[PDB]
Design a protein around this nucleic acid. Structure first.
Ligand SMILES: Nc1ncnc2c1ncn2[C@@H]1O[C@H](COP(=O)(O)OP(=O)(O)O)[C@@H](O)[C@H]1O
Ligand SMILES: [Mg+2]
Lengths: 788, 754
DNA sequence: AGCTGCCAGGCACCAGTG
DNA sequence: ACTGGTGCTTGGCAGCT
C-alpha cells in the first residue's frame, strides 16, 4: 500500500481528503463540474447502495482511486434512497470561480443531510413527525431533547428512571438519536435507527447554556423555564450543535425551547402505549388504531398535532375545559370549515423551508393560496361565540400585505425550481420585463430571418434552428448545400444537412444568450428577495400555522364527537372513574356486531377491581377502553360513553402477562401513586402450581393497601376472588357468560361480584378437545371442588 | 394509451408491464398493487427501469404475482411456479407449482419443480394432513378448482390460481400424463389407481405447458407420496422444531444452518427436502447410515471437487427448455471435468450405495470434449454478440474471422498512413452505427484536412470525414463479422441438438451428484460434531444416552448439558416438573430433533440412540384457545407409535380447570393413546400420577442459588421437583422484600392443603 | 417513437515541444 | 515550465432510423 502523505497527492485529492477528514464516517458527495463524486470506500458503498457504476480515476503516482458519481441535477432522488436507509451525506459544493482559480476551485461542505434534519417535502411523510433527539445519562437519570427542524418545535425533559426513558423514546420515536459516548443503559437505545454516538464534550453544560442563549438572543433561559434543568440542557445543547452543523445557515424558526415536566401530562409507560394501539397496532401497522378512528384532519400539520396530543394527554384543567368548549361550539360548523381548512395545506413545513431559505416556488404558491383562505376562515369563525375559538381566529392572522406580495411576484402555477426561471410574474420588476422582452422579440425575429433567407437564396430546405452545443444556425440540406451563399460561414456539418452562421445571426445569438443570463440572474436575486420580505413576519406566521393546525384538530374532534356519538366528560377533585354505557372507541368500529356498552365505578373506597370471566369474555377490552376513555378525556376530546366523570390521573401503567414480567411489576410497585391508573392483565407466573398466583396476591395486596392506586386486575386465578373479603378497597366484577347445554356464549357485560364458576373446561371443549377427555377433567374438577 | 385497455382485457388477472422508453409502466389497479408490493411511487402510474426489470420480476414472482410484459402485444409472461431463469430463482430454495382439488371422498394434491422435473402426487386423507402438506411443500403458485369447498386451507396463500372444473377431469389427465411420459399407462409409476391425485397432476401439467409453450422433456416421471412412508408433522410442529425456518421467519439458528454445509445449491435443496420428510422405511435409512460411515475418510478430498460441479440440476432445466446461455454450457463443461476425479476418489469406498452413485454419476467424456472444443474458456453472458465459439472448432467460421481481422488490420494501417501523410497527430479512425467508419481530426487541425475528405459530422472539438477507401473496407469488416455472428449462433443451436439426446442420463448424473453432496456433507457433520449411529428396534421406544440439542449446542457459548432419556412401552410418559426457563423445552425438542434425524438417515448428537418406529411427531412447545386447539389435535390424531411433547398445558385458565385438563390429558396419553410422551408441567399435583398408574414416571430440572443469582441447571433428574423459584426470581428482579414475604406466607398456605 | 452516443464541467493524465 | 489532446460516473436529448 502506498504511503499517502500530503505531498504524494494531486491538488484535487489534497482538497478532497481535507474535506473528507471533517466527515470521516459519512458519505461525502463532492461537486466537480456537473457531478457529485465519491472516492475510495464512499464510492464502493455508494455503488452498492445506489446501483451506479464503480469506476477508477487514473493516477500517475500510485494506485487508481475508486470512483462513483451522479449528475448534479439527479441528486435528490439519490439523497432519498440514502436517507431512507438511515445514511447521512455531506454535500460539498464549489464556492469560487474556476476561471480565477489557478489550482482547484474552493470547495465547502454547505449542508449535511441526515435522517432527523431533513426538511424537504420529497423526503418526509406528510402525516408523520420526523424528530431529531439527543439523549444522555447521569448517575441519577436522563436528559433528553427533541427538535422538529421542519417546524422549530424544541423540547427538553428529564426522565427520572429507565422505564420513563423507554416510554419517552417510544412516544417521540426519533428518526435520529444523538447519544453520549459514556451512556450506560444501552438496552434502551441499541437497535434504534439513526443512532449517532457523540463525544462527551458536546454535552458540556456551560457550552449548552452559551449556544442556547445565543440561538435565542437571551442572557439566560429563565424566561423559557429551563434554567433549572442542566440534565436536559446538556442534551438540548448537543442537539442544537448538531442542527447548526447539518444546516450551516441561521435557524430563525428555532426561537424557543420548553420543558416537558412529569406533572404536566399523563405519563403512559411503554406497555400502555403499545397495548392501547394509539398510532401503531400490535403488528406494527397503522390500521385499527385510535388514530385510524379519531384522525380525519384535513391538513398534514393537523394530523401530526392530533397524534402528539393522543400521545401526551394534558393535566391542565383550564386547557381541557377550553378544548371541550371549542368542540361543543364548532359542532355545527365542521362541514363549512373543513373544505376551507384543507386548502391551507401544510403551512408549517413551508414556513420552515422559508426559514431555511430553501423554499421552492410552489411553496410560496401554496403559502399564497393559504393566505387566500384566511378571510373566508375569519368570516366563518366570527359568528362562533366561544372565547377560545376567537383567540385562535385572532392568532391565525390574515397577512393582507404578504398575500398581495406573492400575487404580484409569482405566476399562477410556477415550475418546481427557480433554477430555470419562469417564476417571477410580469409587472413585478421593470428591469426584468425589459430583459425578457429582448429575449422574446426573438422567436419572431428568427422566423422572419428564416423566411427572408429562404426566399432570397431560393433554397427551400433552408431552416433556422438552435443547438446548445453549436448555437444558432441556418440549415440547408446536403443536396442544396453547394448552392449556399459563399458569405455563409460553416458551423456544423451533419449526415444529410449543412449548418451555417452569418454576422446578423451571430450578433442575435450573443444578445439572446446574454439577456437570458441577465433575466435569470435577476429572477434569482428577486426570488431570494421574497425571503427577505417574508422572514421579518416569521414569528407571526409560525403562530398562524399552529393556530390553523389546532383548529383542524378541534374541528375534527367536533365532527368525530358528533358522528361517533361521544359526550363531554367532567373532572372531579379526587381519583375515580365513573363511566355509564362505556365503549371501546376502536373495537366498536371494527366489529361487525353491536358493541355491548359497560359501566365502571372506581373511587378511593372502591379502588381495585378483580375482574374475572372466561377467556374471550372481554376482560382485556374492558380494561383498555377504560384507559382510552381516560386518555381521550385528558386531551380534551369528547369520549365514547353516555356519561363520564373522572379525577386526576398522573400515570398509566400496564402489565400484560419471565424476569421481564417481574421487573415491569416492580417498576409499577415502586412508582405508582394514589393518582395512578394501573392495568394488570393476568400477571403472576411461577414454576409451580401456586408460585405465581401468590405473587399476584401479594402484589394486588400492595396495590390496594399501600400504594392505593386505582387498579383493574384481570385474572384467570379464581383464588383472587377472595381478596375483596380480606382487603379494604377491593371488589369483584366479572364478564358474564352463559352455558346452555354443550356450549358457551360470551355476553360481554360487566356485572358486580365474582362469577359463579370458571369456564376453562368449557372454552377447552369449544376448542375441540375430545369429549372423553373433558368428561374425565370434570370428574377431576369435582374432586378439587370438594376440598372445601 | 387507449391501446393499453385492450391488452389489459387479454389477461385481466395478471399485472401488465407496458414498455415505453427506458421503462415498463403499470396503470390503474396494477400500479396501486405494484407500488405497495415493490417500493415505487404513484402519479395512476408506477414504473420500473429496463436495466433492472428481471429484479422486479423476481420480487413480484417471489410474492405470488404473475406478470405479463408488453412490447404492440404481450410477448412474455412469468408465473411464480413456472420460472427457471437463474435471475428469478433463489439459489438454495425450491420453487414449486402445486395443484389441489377435493372430492366427496378426499383431496388430490400434486407438486412440480419445473427446473428438476420432480413431479409428486398425493391423496391426503383429511383436512389436517392436507394443511400439513401445504405448509411442508410451500408452493409458490397454487391451482385450485372453482368448487373447492375447504377455502380455509388455501385462503391466505400467495399465488392462488382459480381454475375451471374441466381441467381436473380424470380421462383427460390420464391421457395427457401418458403422453408426456411416453407410456400407455401409469402402472410403472405406481399411480394408476390414484384418480384424485391424477386429476390434480393433469391440471398442473396443462398449466405448466401453457405457460411454457414448449415441450418439457425433463419431466419424464411421477411419484406418489404415501401417509405411512413418512413421519407426519403438522405446521405448528414443523415451525416449533425450526427445521429450515426459525420462529422469526429467518434461516439462522435453525437445524439446516447447522446440518447443511453442502457445496452445491442442488444438494442444499435436497438436504432440506430430506429434513422436512423423514421416512419410516429403515431399509433406506440403513443405507444412508452406511454411506455416511463409509465416506468419513473421503470427505476432505471430495468436497472441493463437488463444489466445482455447481447447480447442474437447474442448468439442465435450461437445456431442456432450450434457454441455456453460454455460461450455463461453460459450467456444465466445468462439471464434466470433475467426474473423472470423483470417479477415482470413490472407487475405493467400501459401499454398494456409493458405488451405485458413482455409476449413475456418469462420465460423458464425448460431451466434455465437445464443449472443450466448441466454446471458449470464459464466454460472455449472452450469445447475442458472438465471441462464444472457440477458434479451431469450425473452419468456415475461422475464415470469416480472419477476413474481418484483415480488414480491421487494414484500417489501423490506413490510420497510421493518413496520419503520416497529412502530418496531423490527432488523426484517427473510429466507428459508430450512424457513420460507420470515419476519420476524425480535431477542430484545431481540421482546416488542413485533405480535399478528398468528405465532411460528415461536426463535434464540439472535432470533425469526422469519410473517403471511398474507408467505406470499402467497412464493407469487408461488417459483412464478415455478420456471417461469423450468424454462424456462431447456428453452431450454438447445434450444441443443443447434440447434448439433448443424453438428457435422461444427465438428469441422473445431476441427481446422483446431488445425493452425494447430501451424504458427503452429513458424513462430515457426523464426524465433525461427535454424532453417533442410531439403531432401530421393532417396538416403540427411545433410549438416548448423553443426547444433545444440535442447534443449541453449536449456537450458545455456554457448556451444553447432555441428558438421558428412557421411553419404552413400560415407561411411556415422563412428567417433567421444575423451572422451565428454556431447559424443559430444549430437552423436549432435542428429543424430537434426534428422532427426526434418526429418521433422515443421519447420525445424531448422542453417545447412543436406540429408537422404535414413529408415525408422527407432535410438539406443542412454547391464547389459551390456541394452546387447547393444538392439544385437541394431538388427542384426536396421536397413536401408540406417536411421539408427543407438551409444554405446561393448563396455563391461561384457573388453577383447578387447568389442573383437571392436564390430568385428564396425561391419563389419556398414557392409558388410551399410549404415545411416547414428555409431559412438561408446573402442577405438583400431577407428580402423584405415577402412583395412580402404569407407565408413568417423574423427572425434573432444578436450579442452584449462589452469590446473587440463580443458575437454572439443565440436567434432568429422577423424581418430582421439591422447589419453586417464582419468588426467588421476583426478589432478584426487585419486587419489594415485604411483598415477597407476604407471597411466601400465601404460597405455604395454598400448597399446604394439597 | 426507439436506439446510440455526444455532452455537461470539473481536474488529472499523458505526450510532444521550451 | 506551456499546448492540446484523452477519460469518467448518469441522464438528457439530438440525430439518425
Ligand atoms: N363489549 C364488547 N362487545 C362486543 N364484543 C366485545 C366486547 N368486549 C370485547 N369483545 C370482543 O371479544 C373478544 C375477546 O375480547 P378480550 O378483551 O380479549 O377478552 P379476554 O381478555 O377476557 O379473554 C375480542 O374479539 C373483542 O373484540
Ligand atoms: Mg385478555
Amino acid at each position: 500500500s502506498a504511503i499517502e502523505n500530503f505531498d504524494a497527492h494531486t491538488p484535487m485529492m489534497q482538497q478532497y481528503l481535507r474535506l473528507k477528514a471533517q466527515h470521516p464516517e459519512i458519505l461525502l458527495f463532492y461537486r466537480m463540474g456537473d457531478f457529485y463524486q465519491l472516492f475510495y470506500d464512499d464510492a464502493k458503498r455508494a455503488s452498492q447502495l445506489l446501483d451506479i457504476s464503480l469506476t477508477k480515476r487514473g493516477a500517475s503516482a500510485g494506485e487508481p482511486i475508486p470512483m462513483a458519481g451522479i449528475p448534479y441535477h439527479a441528486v435528490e432522488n439519490y439523497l432519498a434512497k440514502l436517507v431512507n436507509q438511515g445514511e447521512s451525506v455531506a454535500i460539498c459544493e464549489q464556492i469560487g470561480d474556476p476561471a480565477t482559480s489557478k489550482g482547484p476551485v474552493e470547495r465547502k461542505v454547505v449542508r449535511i443531510v441526515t435522517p432527523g434534519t431533513i426538511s424537504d417535502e420529497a423526503l418526509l411523510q406528510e402525516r408523520q413527525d420526523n424528530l431529531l433527539a439527543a439523549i444522555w445519562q447521569d448517575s441519577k437519570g436522563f436528559g433528553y431533547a427533541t427538535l422538529d427542524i421542519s417546524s422549530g418545535r424544541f423540547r427538553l425533559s428529564e426522565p427520572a428512571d429507565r422505564e420513563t426513558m423507554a416510554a419517552e423514546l417510544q412516544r417521540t420515536n426519533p428518526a435520529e438519536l444523538l447519544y453520549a459516548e459514556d451512556f450506560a443503559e444501552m438496552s434502551l437505545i441499541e437497535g434504534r435507527r439513526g443512532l449517532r454516538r457523540r463525544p462527551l464534550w458536546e454535552f458540556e453544560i456551560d457550552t449548552a447554556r452559551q449556544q442556547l442563549n445565543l440561538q435565542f438572543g437571551t442572557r439566560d433561559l429563565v424566561g423559557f423555564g429551563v434554567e433549572n434543568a442542566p440534565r436536559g440542557l446538556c442534551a438540548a445543547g448537543c442537539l442544537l450543535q448538531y442542527a447548526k452543523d447539518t444546516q450551516r445557515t441561521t435557524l430563525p424558526h428555532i426561537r424557543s425551547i420548553t420543558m416537558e415536566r412529569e406533572q404536566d401530562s399523563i405519563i403512559m409507560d411503554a406497555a400502555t402505549r403499545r397495548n392501547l394501539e394509539i398510532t401503531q397496532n400490535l403488528a406494527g401497522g397503522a390500521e385499527n388504531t385510535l388514530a385510524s378512528v379519531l384522525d380525519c384532519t384535513v391538513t398534514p400539520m393537523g394530523s401530526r398535532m392530533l397524534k402528539r396530543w393522543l400521545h401526551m394527554p394534558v393535566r391542565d384543567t383550564r386547557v381541557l375545559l377550553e378544548r371541550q368548549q371549542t368542540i361543543g361550539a364548532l359542532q355545527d360548523f365542521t362541514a363549512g370549515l373543513q373544505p376551507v381548512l384543507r386548502q391551507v395545506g401544510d403551512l408549517e413545513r413551508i414556513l420552515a423551508r422559508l426559514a431555511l431559505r430553501t423554499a421552492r416556488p410552489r411553496d410560496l404558491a401554496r403559502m399564497r393560496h393559504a393566505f387566500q383562505q384566511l378571510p373566508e376562515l375569519r368570516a366563518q369563525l366570527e359568528t362562533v361565540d366561544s372565547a377560545p375559538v376567537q383567540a385562535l381566529r385572532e392568532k391565525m392572522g390574515e397577512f393582507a400585505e404578504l398575500r398581495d406580495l406573492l400575487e404580484r411576484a409569482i405566476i399562477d402555477t410556477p415550475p418546481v425550481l427557480v433554477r430555470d426561471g419562469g417564476v417571477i410574474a410580469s409587472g413585478y420588476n421593470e428591469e426584468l420585463d425589459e430583459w425578457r422582452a429582448l429575449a422574446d422579440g426573438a422567436t419572431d425575429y428568427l422566423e422572419r430571418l428564416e423566411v427572408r433567407e429562404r426566399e432570397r437564396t431560393g433554397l427551400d430546405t433552408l431552416k433556422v434552428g438552435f443547438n446548445a452545443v453549436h448555437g444558432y444556425y441556418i440549415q440547408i440540406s446536403r443536396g442544396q448545400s453547394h448552392l449556399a451563399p459563399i458569405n455563409y460561414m460553416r458551423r456544423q456539418t451533419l449526415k444529410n444537412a449543412e449548418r451555417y452562421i452569418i454576422p446578423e445571426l451571430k450578433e442575435y445569438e450573443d444578445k439572446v444568450l446574454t439577456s437570458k443570463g441577465k433575466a435569470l440572474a435577476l429572477e434569482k436575486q428577486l426570488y431570494e428577495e421574497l425571503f427577505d420580505l417574508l422572514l421579518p413576519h416569521l414569528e407571526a406566521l409560525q403562530q398562524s400555522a399552529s393556530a390553523l393546525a389546532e383548529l383542524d384538530v378541534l374541528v375534527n374532534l367536533a365532527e368525530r364527537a358528533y358522528t361517533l356519538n361521544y359526550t363531554c366528560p367532567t373532572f372531579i377533585d379526587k381519583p375515580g372513574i365513573r363511566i355509564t354505557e362505556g365503549r371501546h372507541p376502536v373495537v366498536e368500529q371494527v366489529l361487525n356486531e353491536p358493541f355491548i356498552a359497560n359501566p365502571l365505578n372506581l373511587s378511593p373506597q372502591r379502588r381495585m377491581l378483580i375482574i374475572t370471566g372466561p377467556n374471550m369474555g372481554g376482560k382485556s377490552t374492558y380494561m383498555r377502553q377504560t384507559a382510552l376513555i381516560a386518555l381521550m378525556a385528558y386531551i380534551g376530546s369528547y369520549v365514547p360513553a353516555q356519561k363520564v366523570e373522572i379525577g386526576p390521573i398522573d400515570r398509566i401503567f400496564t402489565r400484560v402477562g419471565f424476569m421481564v414480567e417481574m421487573t415491569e411489576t416492580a417498576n409499577i410497585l415502586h412508582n405508582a401513586t394514589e393518582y395512578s391508573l394501573v392495568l394488570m392483565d393476568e400477571i403472576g407466573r411461577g414454576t409451580s402450581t401456586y408460585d405465581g398466583l401468590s405473587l399476584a396476591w401479594a402484589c394486588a395486596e400492595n396495590l390496594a393497601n399501600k400504594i392505593k392506586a386505582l387498579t383493574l386486575f384481570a385474572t384467570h386465578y379464581f383464588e383472587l376472588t377472595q381478596l375483596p373479603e380480606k382487603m379494604e378497597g377491593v371488589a369483584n366484577v366479572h364478564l358474564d357468560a352463559l352455558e346452555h347445554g354443550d356450549t358457551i356464549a360470551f355476553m360481554h357485560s360487566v356485572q358486580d361480584g365474582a362469577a359463579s364458576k370458571s369456564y376453562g373446561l368449557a372454552v377447552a371443549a369449544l376448542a375441540g378437545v375430545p369429549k372423553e377427555v373433558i368428561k374425565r377433567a370434570r370428574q377431576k374438577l369435582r374432586e378439587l371442588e370438594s376440598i372445601s
